[PDB]
Design a protein around this ligand. Structure first.
Ligand SMILES: COc1cc(C(=O)N2C[C@@H](n3cc(C4CC4)nn3)C[C@H]2C(=O)N[C@H]2CCCC[C@@H]2c2ccccc2)ccc1CN
Ligand SMILES: [Ca+2]
Length: 223
């Protein structure tokens, strides 16, 4: 997260860190046994890390649970990042409390102008690299489909939305992908892609979660 703020320990209780020997992606807990992430976060040997603040120190609220199954969206295209969504089943159910909690799925799609919360352990610099240890947050609005399409000609599908600031300076970044975009307590987006970070007219691009609720519910109900 570039130009964000320190969330505060366990203040984003649904935020998970996907670890394969190191943090490589964010995720969102949607029930005690399932995490929602980006399909580009797919890999073998994922350990889901819940209740994290500092991802480099055991602070006492973590739950480390290996993934038993990963389900990439059947229509994910890694070249266009269309349908950039994946489900991860936990080997054991997470113990839910105030610090480790599921995030509700949307009942409807959030509009442009809706204020959301984006969070993650991604790079905090727009030029250069600095990975934070603690969870970073960014309050950002959803951008109109027209401004999103104008920023990224020929790249925005009906399964994507932009959020952030066209003036730049505040964006998600390397390491935040897979993580949440939560608006009014609903998971509306997954950190997906961009062109650099916090650059003018290049806001972050997010997977449009409301388009996947039926697939998520059906998948959970059968796996
Ligand atoms: C460039 O813009 C952004 C970027 C991000 C952001 O985090 N990204 C962009 C994501 N991505 C993947 C792909 C296609 C090729 C499959 N296109 N974009 C991956 C992630 C990232 O680089 N993660 C590093 C951080 C270090 C360890 C390895 C991780 C990693 C690399 C690859 C796959 C998973 C994890 C998130 C938000 C924005 C918006 N500014
Ligand atoms: Ca920790």
């Amino acid at each position: 997260i570039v130009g964000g703020y320190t969330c505060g320990a366990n203040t984003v209780p649904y935020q998970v860190s996907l670890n394969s020997g190191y943090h490589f992606c964010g995720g969102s807990l949607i029930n005690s046994q399932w995490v929602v992430s980006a399909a580009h976060c797919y890999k073998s040997g994922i350990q889901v890390r819940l209740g994290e603040d500092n991802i480099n120190v055991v602070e006492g609220n973590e739950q480390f649970i290996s993934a038993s199954k990963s389900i990439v969206h059947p229509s994910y295209n890694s070249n266009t990042l269309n349908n950039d969504i994946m489900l991860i089943k936990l080997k054991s159910a997470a113990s839910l409390n105030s610090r480790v909690a599921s995030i509700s799925l949307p009942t409807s799609c959030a509009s442009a102008g809706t204020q959301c919360l984006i969070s993650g352990w991604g790079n905090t610099k727009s030029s250069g690299t600095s990975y934070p240890d603690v969870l970073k947050c960014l309050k950002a609005p959803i951008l109109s489909d027209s401004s999103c399409k104008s920023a990224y000609p020929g790249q925005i599908t009906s399964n994507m939305f932009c959020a952030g600031y066209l003036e730049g300076g505040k964006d998600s970044c390397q390491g935040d992908s897979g993580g949440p975009v939560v608006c009014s307590g609903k998971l509306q987006g997954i950190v997906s892609w961009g062109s650099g970070c916090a650059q003018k007219n290049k806001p972050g691009v997010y997977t449009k979660v409301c388009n996947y609720v039926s697939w998520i519910k059906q998948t959970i109900a059968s796996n």
